[PDB]
Design an enzyme around this catalytic site. Sequence first.
Site, PDB file in Angstrom:
ATOM      1  N   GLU A   1       0.808  -1.215   0.000  1.00  0.00           N
ATOM      2  CA  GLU A   1       0.000   0.000   0.000  1.00  0.00           C
ATOM      3  C   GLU A   1       0.843   1.269   0.000  1.00  0.00           C
ATOM      4  O   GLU A   1       0.339   2.324  -0.397  1.00  0.00           O
ATOM      5  CB  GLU A   1      -0.937   0.002   1.211  1.00  0.00           C
ATOM      6  CG  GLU A   1      -2.137  -0.936   1.090  1.00  0.00           C
ATOM      7  CD  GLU A   1      -3.046  -0.595  -0.076  1.00  0.00           C
ATOM      8  OE1 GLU A   1      -3.326   0.604  -0.283  1.00  0.00           O
ATOM      9  OE2 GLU A   1      -3.481  -1.527  -0.785  1.00  0.00           O
TER      10      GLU A   1
ATOM     11  N   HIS B   1     -16.299  -5.946  -7.802  1.00  0.00           N
ATOM     12  CA  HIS B   1     -15.973  -4.937  -8.805  1.00  0.00           C
ATOM     13  C   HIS B   1     -17.097  -4.757  -9.818  1.00  0.00           C
ATOM     14  O   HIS B   1     -17.369  -3.633 -10.254  1.00  0.00           O
ATOM     15  CB  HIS B   1     -14.672  -5.314  -9.514  1.00  0.00           C
ATOM     16  CG  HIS B   1     -13.450  -5.103  -8.677  1.00  0.00           C
ATOM     17  ND1 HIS B   1     -12.951  -6.069  -7.830  1.00  0.00           N
ATOM     18  CD2 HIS B   1     -12.628  -4.034  -8.551  1.00  0.00           C
ATOM     19  CE1 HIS B   1     -11.874  -5.607  -7.221  1.00  0.00           C
ATOM     20  NE2 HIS B   1     -11.656  -4.374  -7.641  1.00  0.00           N
TER      21      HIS B   1
END
EC number: 3.4.17.23
Lengths: 596, 248
Positions: A357, A487
């Site tokens: 991240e 998604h």
Amino acid sequence: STIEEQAKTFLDKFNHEAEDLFYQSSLASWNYNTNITEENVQNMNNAGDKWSAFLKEQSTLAQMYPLQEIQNLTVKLQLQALQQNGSSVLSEDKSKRLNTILNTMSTIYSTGKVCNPDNPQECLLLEPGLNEIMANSLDYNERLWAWESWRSEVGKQLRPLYEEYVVLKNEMARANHYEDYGDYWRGDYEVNGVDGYDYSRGQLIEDVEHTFEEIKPLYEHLHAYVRAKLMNAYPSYISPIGCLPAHLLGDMWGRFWTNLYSLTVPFGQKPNIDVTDAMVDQAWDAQRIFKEAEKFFVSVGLPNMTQGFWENSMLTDPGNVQKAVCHPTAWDLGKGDFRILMCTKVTMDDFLTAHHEMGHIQYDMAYAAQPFLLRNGANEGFHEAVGEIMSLSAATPKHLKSIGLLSPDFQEDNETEINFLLKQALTIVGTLPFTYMLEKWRWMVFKGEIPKDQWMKKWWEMKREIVGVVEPVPHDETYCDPASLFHVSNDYSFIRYYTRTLYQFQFQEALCQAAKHEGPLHKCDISNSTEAGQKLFNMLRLGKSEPWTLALENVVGAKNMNVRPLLNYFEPLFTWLKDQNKNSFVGWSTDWSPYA
Amino acid sequence: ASVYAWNRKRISNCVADYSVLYNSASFSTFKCYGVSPTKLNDLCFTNVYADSFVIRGDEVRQIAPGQTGKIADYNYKLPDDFTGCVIAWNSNNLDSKVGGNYNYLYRLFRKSNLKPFERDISTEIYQAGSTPCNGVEGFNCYFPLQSYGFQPTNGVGYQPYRVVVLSFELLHAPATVCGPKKSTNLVKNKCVNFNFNGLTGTGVLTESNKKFLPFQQFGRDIADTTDAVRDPQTLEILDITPCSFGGV
Ligand SMILES: *[C@@H]1O[C@H](CO)[C@@H](O[C@@H]2O[C@H](CO)[C@@H](O)[C@H](O)[C@H]2NC(C)=O)[C@H](O)[C@H]1NC(C)=O
Ligand SMILES: *[C@@H]1O[C@H](CO)[C@@H](O)[C@H](O)[C@H]1NC(C)=O
Ligand SMILES: *[C@@H]1O[C@H](CO)[C@@H](O)[C@H](O)[C@H]1NC(C)=O
Ligand SMILES: *[C@@H]1O[C@H](CO)[C@@H](O)[C@H](O)[C@H]1NC(C)=O
Ligand SMILES: *[C@@H]1O[C@H](CO)[C@@H](O)[C@H](O)[C@H]1NC(C)=O
Ligand SMILES: *[C@@H]1O[C@H](CO)[C@@H](O)[C@H](O)[C@H]1NC(C)=O
């Protein structure tokens, strides 16, 4: 008296106005993801609504700009992105079907249900309820029920909603002078205006399919190998002559095969590469987990993190009343403000997620000098693949022994790498056919050459051919199991994950050649090499100001989406899999054998 | 004030202590162009006009002689060979607010480059195209004025840094005020070099019985030979004689 000097005046006005409004919306969204109250949902939506309405006014003003005379390419890309009408083409009676349907789809996905019909004991949400029944249990009967606990209880109410969704989102393309809505998502990869560097929208379907005829022989041997170590838990329930059930592939949808690593370990007698026990002996905390990630990046050559992040972001789960979700996501608030939103733990994944991240953050300040409209990745696959190349390097045994997490005496035989490479193969190779098949199904249903009664008979027959999954139970057209994924329901382009793998390994071979590593790519490291850091930083700082095909020639020298430097990563695994599959039935045809 | 409304006030008839700036331990852009921080104390130039304005962190480098850009070209241009120093420090604690500090504006577009050391105050709108704008925003008006947004959570790159500019040029005006030259250790009854304001020599320093009027700096007795000085930091009159010498 020229339009070119008139556009540069307007884009200079828009850049300062938008970055003030975007920071207010991003700061409000940050507070929503840290301190959830009743007013904070309204507070974020108040700033987010006026930011979306600001783009509606600026898109109409930039339309009177004719493009046929702007020789400058930096403002041509800015005007193409700013002039995207989006929802402004639709009527008032049609624009209300966007925000109503999309929030109903999101709310439907947020309903967690594993309560048994005619047996209402209890059921939790998705993370505590759905994930334990898919990642730990090895029972065929209840997992088939758990497969039908979500694909027959959540997807049953989307058929009249999602089919209405794919007939009006498809109409925007003719109003935006696109072919269809599947072609609209390929505009991110579209490059125009440069002679010899142009990337057509329809050639991308061909290029993805052209790179798939060498992914397949790797996936042919992977599926053949994984079917012999899956029948140990289910002896008489699956036949080793056909394909695999859908509810036995790691996830509910089979996207990630990480949970099959425990079931299909090749040789588990010697211990695995696990340092979760090592950090609790040395008393590691949230600060020291991200501190070693920061010194990893500055050893490569990237600039270190600013002082307004360590004392400003949150790391652990704070307080008791704050029930905010801390899914690992990267925050780019703008104006030099960069945050990381995740809950730290002393585990394998959170240490890698700490490296993973941060890479999106390290990509975000690189194009900070670019204007606001070009302050983004080169396409949708760059911003995800850049954040994953350091995850491959941080998991190497060489990097683990450099910090001191791994034991100083850890031998590297054949199986100490096959265990590591097969863990990476289940999470990388196994998700390529699932990503390509779903986007191929979504592209044709958006094209419209699929009738209403042919969704499932075409969706299931291609899942059986490309991915190779036998349906655990036959399903008619009233089922809507392809829309259950995260998604697809939230309007996310899933093609960015297929190109994520092909990008994160193109960069890996380029950076390892820059660091002059003597050995294969699995043992390669990026750290302690300022030559590799300078190679990456030249392409990270470009952003969307340059075409993405020019970003590839700065690292790999190939203007196209190269797939060759990905099979070379799994050659130690591929040569062993070819020897292991000497007698197994490798290569499936169409197989209705188990569930005829 | 804003960058486009920078003030210009003369500093004269007072001593400017530059030593305290060195040990402030809070500056970030304490740089001098055309002069050294050490050598501007012993000697000084008139025209000590100071300009006050706020420059963002990213645009600090743009403010330097011989350097062009956006702020240096349309808001405030430094002339070449600028014999002065730039002093800046962070002002996040006070020059910032939640939701954006909409108190500082700047000029974003200009027909012609700004003359160095020129302050322009006008409401004229930019003319990007050929068709004139009649006060109503159109396709070629582009109101240049914009308000910066400063927040406490903003990054260091765009942090609003409080910056002041000091100019030092030697025009035809002499008898100006200079920096601090604090003192040495005065020595009595010893042959010591002395160089007061306007005179210098060598001799022995000792107390004096004579009295000097309150508007002199030194004195002489015969043949333009200085023999007494009245230093102004002590308000005392002393006697000076050459130290002992002779032929052996
Ligand atoms: C990358 O460079 C660092 C910096 O030299 C290496 O850290 C050194 O590691 C050795 C043994 O592992 C120690 O004896 C040194 O004291 C360490 N140096 C410092 C400054 O702490 C690190 O090992 C290198 N890693 C790789 C993979 O080359
Ligand atoms: C955090 O949320 C609680 C209630 O959810 C609220 O009482 C408190 O004021 C909030 N604190 C901050 C700093 O937002
Ligand atoms: C476009 O304009 C920008 C403005 O600074 C300039 O830097 C760039 O070189 C120009 N590009 C071309 C191709 O003219
Ligand atoms: C956006 O909508 C306006 C309003 O009809 C239209 O004039 C313009 O051509 C549209 N933009 C595009 C790119 O189609
Ligand atoms: C980043 O590196 C620079 C260069 O060594 C150093 O001056 C600075 O203190 C570092 N900042 C952090 C937060 O580590
Ligand atoms: C890997 O396997 C080959 C084939 O048996 C063997 O010759 C070789 O020694 C093995 N490597 C190690 C490090 O044991």
